[PDB]
Coordinates of N, CA and C in Angstrom, one line a residue:
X1 N -0.1 -6.5 10.4 CA 0.9 -6.5 10.1 C 1.7 -5.1 9.6
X2 N 2.6 -5.3 9.4 CA 4.5 -4.1 9.6 C 3.9 -3.7 7.4
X3 N 3.6 -2.3 7.6 CA 3.5 -1.7 6.2 C 4.4 -0.9 6.3
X4 N 5.1 -0.2 4.7 CA 6.4 0.4 4.9 C 5.1 1.8 4.3
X5 N 6.3 2.8 4.3 CA 6.4 4.2 4.3 C 6.1 4.9 2.5
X6 N 6.4 6.1 2.3 CA 6.8 5.8 1.0 C 7.6 5.0 0.2
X7 N 8.6 5.5 1.0 CA 10.2 4.4 0.4 C 10.6 3.0 1.2
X8 N 9.8 2.0 0.6 CA 10.2 0.5 1.2 C 11.7 0.5 1.9
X9 N 11.8 1.6 2.6 CA 13.4 1.3 4.0 C 12.7 1.9 5.2
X10 N 11.5 2.3 5.7 CA 10.9 2.9 6.4 C 10.2 2.0 7.0
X11 N 9.2 1.1 8.2 CA 7.7 1.1 7.5 C 8.0 0.2 9.3
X12 N 7.1 0.2 9.6 CA 6.6 -0.2 11.4 C 5.1 -0.8 11.2
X13 N 4.5 -1.3 12.6 CA 3.3 -2.3 12.4 C 2.1 -1.5 12.5
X14 N 0.6 -1.8 11.6 CA -0.1 -0.8 11.9 C -1.3 -1.9 12.4
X15 N -1.4 -1.8 13.9 CA -2.5 -2.5 15.0 C -3.5 -1.3 14.4
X16 N -3.4 -0.2 14.8 CA -5.0 0.4 14.6 C -5.9 -0.6 13.4
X17 N -6.8 -1.2 13.7 CA -7.3 -1.7 12.8 C -7.0 -2.3 11.7
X18 N -5.8 -2.6 11.6 CA -5.2 -2.7 10.7 C -4.3 -4.2 10.5
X19 N -4.4 -4.6 9.3 CA -4.4 -6.2 8.9 C -3.3 -6.5 7.5
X20 N -3.6 -5.4 7.0 CA -2.7 -5.3 5.3 C -2.3 -3.9 4.7
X21 N -1.2 -4.3 4.0 CA -1.1 -3.0 3.1 C -1.2 -2.8 2.1
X22 N -1.3 -1.6 1.6 CA -2.0 -1.1 0.4 C -1.2 0.0 -0.6
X23 N -1.0 0.0 -1.4 CA 0.0 1.0 -2.9 C -0.5 1.5 -3.4
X24 N -1.0 3.0 -3.9 CA -1.7 3.1 -4.8 C -0.5 3.9 -6.0
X25 N -0.5 3.6 -6.8 CA 0.0 3.8 -8.1 C -0.5 5.0 -9.0
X26 N 0.1 5.7 -9.9 CA -0.7 6.7 -10.6 C -0.9 6.0 -12.3
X27 N -1.8 6.2 -13.1 CA -2.4 5.7 -14.3 C -1.9 4.0 -14.0
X28 N -0.7 3.9 -13.6 CA -0.6 2.0 -14.3 C 0.4 1.6 -12.7
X29 N 0.3 0.3 -12.9 CA 0.7 0.1 -11.0 C 2.4 -0.4 -11.8
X30 N 2.6 -0.9 -12.9 CA 4.0 -1.7 -13.0 C 4.9 -0.1 -13.1
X31 N 4.7 1.4 -13.0 CA 5.1 1.5 -12.6 C 5.5 2.2 -11.1
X32 N 6.7 2.6 -10.9 CA 6.5 3.3 -8.9 C 4.9 3.8 -8.8
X33 N 4.8 3.6 -7.3 CA 4.0 4.1 -6.6 C 3.9 5.2 -6.4
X34 N 2.5 5.8 -6.2 CA 2.8 7.1 -5.7 C 2.5 7.5 -3.8
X35 N 1.7 6.5 -3.4 CA 1.5 6.5 -1.8 C 0.8 5.6 -1.6
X36 N 1.0 4.9 0.1 CA 0.6 3.7 0.2 C 0.1 4.0 1.6
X37 N -0.5 2.9 2.3 CA -0.8 2.5 3.6 C -1.2 1.2 4.3
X38 N -1.9 1.7 5.4 CA -1.9 -0.2 5.9 C -3.7 0.2 5.7
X39 N -4.9 -1.3 5.9 CA -5.5 -0.7 5.8 C -6.3 -2.4 6.4
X40 N -7.2 -2.3 6.8 CA -8.2 -3.6 7.2 C -8.5 -4.5 5.7
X41 N -9.4 -3.9 5.2 CA -10.2 -4.3 3.9 C -9.6 -3.8 2.4
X42 N -9.6 -4.4 1.5 CA -8.9 -3.7 -0.3 C -10.0 -2.9 -0.4
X43 N -10.0 -1.3 -0.7 CA -10.4 -0.2 -1.3 C -11.0 -0.8 -2.5
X44 N -11.7 0.1 -3.0 CA -12.4 0.2 -4.4 C -11.1 0.4 -5.2
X45 N -11.1 0.1 -6.5 CA -10.2 -0.4 -7.3 C -10.5 1.4 -7.9
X46 N -9.9 2.2 -8.1 CA -9.7 3.4 -9.1 C -9.2 3.5 -10.6
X47 N -9.6 4.1 -11.3 CA -9.2 3.9 -13.0 C -7.8 4.9 -13.0
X48 N -8.2 5.9 -12.2 CA -7.2 6.9 -12.5 C -5.6 6.0 -11.8
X49 N -6.1 5.9 -10.7 CA -4.6 5.4 -9.5 C -5.0 3.9 -9.6
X50 N -4.4 3.3 -9.6 CA -4.1 1.5 -9.3 C -4.1 1.3 -7.7
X51 N -4.7 0.2 -7.6 CA -4.8 -0.4 -6.1 C -4.5 -1.6 -5.7
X52 N -3.2 -1.5 -5.3 CA -2.8 -3.3 -4.7 C -2.5 -3.1 -3.5
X53 N -3.5 -4.5 -2.8 CA -3.4 -4.5 -1.8 C -2.1 -5.9 -1.8
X54 N -2.4 -5.4 -0.1 CA -1.4 -7.1 0.1 C -1.4 -7.5 1.7
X55 N -0.7 -8.5 2.3 CA -1.4 -8.9 3.5 C 0.3 -9.4 3.6
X56 N 1.6 -9.0 3.3 CA 2.8 -9.5 3.8 C 3.9 -8.5 3.7
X57 N 4.6 -8.6 5.3 CA 5.5 -7.4 5.5 C 6.5 -6.5 4.5
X58 N 6.0 -5.5 4.5 CA 7.3 -5.5 3.4 C 6.5 -5.6 2.2
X59 N 5.4 -5.3 2.0 CA 4.7 -5.8 0.5 C 4.7 -4.4 0.3
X60 N 4.6 -3.5 0.0 CA 4.8 -2.1 -0.3 C 6.0 -1.6 -0.4

């Protein structure tokens, strides 16, 4: 799938054993995220940073 970088302006495809995109938010997810990348499986959600996975292009 095609995932975006920090800003939802630049994004590409994540073939490297990746078919999902994720975004990590600080404290809360409601607010803007802090980092994001591609992944094959949703990682463990932390209490410090909120984990949000998706399978849609430009989801992050």
